[PDB]
């Protein structure tokens with residue numbers, strides 16, 4: 656693997672550029688927040704009996 | 706940030722040492738370096754990833770935080786290892802000019818001072834290690850005490 | 855018209871105001887991808903232009 | 905990682921006519937410098953968190969203290985203790 660790429664710098668550069676582009680695209684579509692979602696769901700039932 | 710440069714540092718240091726101590730053209734000095742240290746990279750990467758693998762296997766708020774930390778750490782480390790294997794050799798063989806004979810030597814100012822200090826530190830460290838190995842019993846009790854503390 | 859009178863779109867009009875066109879944006883990506891692939895295959899930055 | 909960097913090289917080197925002590929000493933001598941480089945790069949990188957301040961600095965300081973001191977002390981102790989571990993383990997669990 657290491658001997659294959661020692662003779663082909665341009666192919667390695669191409670792979671690196673593809674990785675960079677993928678990273679930028681991923682950054683462009685990531686929501687921001689303070690902390691991850693850690694709260695569990697809850698359901699409340701309301702009743703009235705005057 | 707400080708962990709993704711370990712493999713590249715290892716590779717570059719090995720190739721630089723070979724070039725400086727053997728006077729070798731970069732293209733095959735790189736191949737020799739890759740042959741020598743092709744297993745250390747994989748060992749280091751496996752060791753690093755095996756500890757962050759279990760963090761992503763818990764539930765709750767703590768589990769969520771652990772997953773968020775561990776997945777990012779592991780993905781970055783894996784990409785760093787792949788890049789060190791793939792791209793580092795190419796640049797080190799093509800974009801790195803030949804080292805002039807003794808170019809690293811004859812440094813003056815801060816660099817020469819630092820080189821002397823580091824040589825002295827290495828000599829002292831080797832002298833201490835060679836000694837700590839003739840007492841394999843007392844040092845074990847010292848280690849046990851350290852662990853207990 | 856004074857305040858108290860607004861405007862809304864319907865049917866086909868909704869998406870036009872919701873955005874324009876982005877066909878040119880994607881056409882450029884398909885060229886960069888082809889250039890990168892051809893550069894990797896040829897092992898040279900200059901030939902893929904032909 | 906720091907321990908394996910020496911253990912693997914010593915294991916490879918002893919397999920060819922090298923005693924345990926000789927292999928351990930040679931491995932330590934050859935692997936010293938990269939270990940220091942890789943450890944202190946991390947230490948200097950994490951220093952910014954150690955002295956954090958401003959908005960949301962409590963968590964930064966909390967993580968920085970532990971990581972910084974653990975790395976420093978662990979590296980300083982390991983660089984001197986790992987060869988002993990290799991020698992003792994090889995001597996007791998023969999083969």
Ligand SMILES: CCCCCCCCCCCCCCCCCCCC(=O)O[C@H](COC(=O)CCCCCCCCCCCCCC)COP(=O)(O)OCCN
Pocket residue numbers: 762763
């Ligand atoms: C000559 C050589 C002879 C070889 C020796 C002979 C063969 C002996 C083989 C013995 C095999 C070990 C038997 C251990 C029983 C398994 C213990 C429970 C495992 C379990 O519940 O799942 C784990 C729970 O961790 C979680 O994430 C959930 C939280 C609970 C974790 C607390 C459990 C304590 C774990 C301490 C270590 C236990 C062993 C773990 C390997 C996650 O693991 P998994 O279910 O996903 O399985 C990995 C599949 N890829």
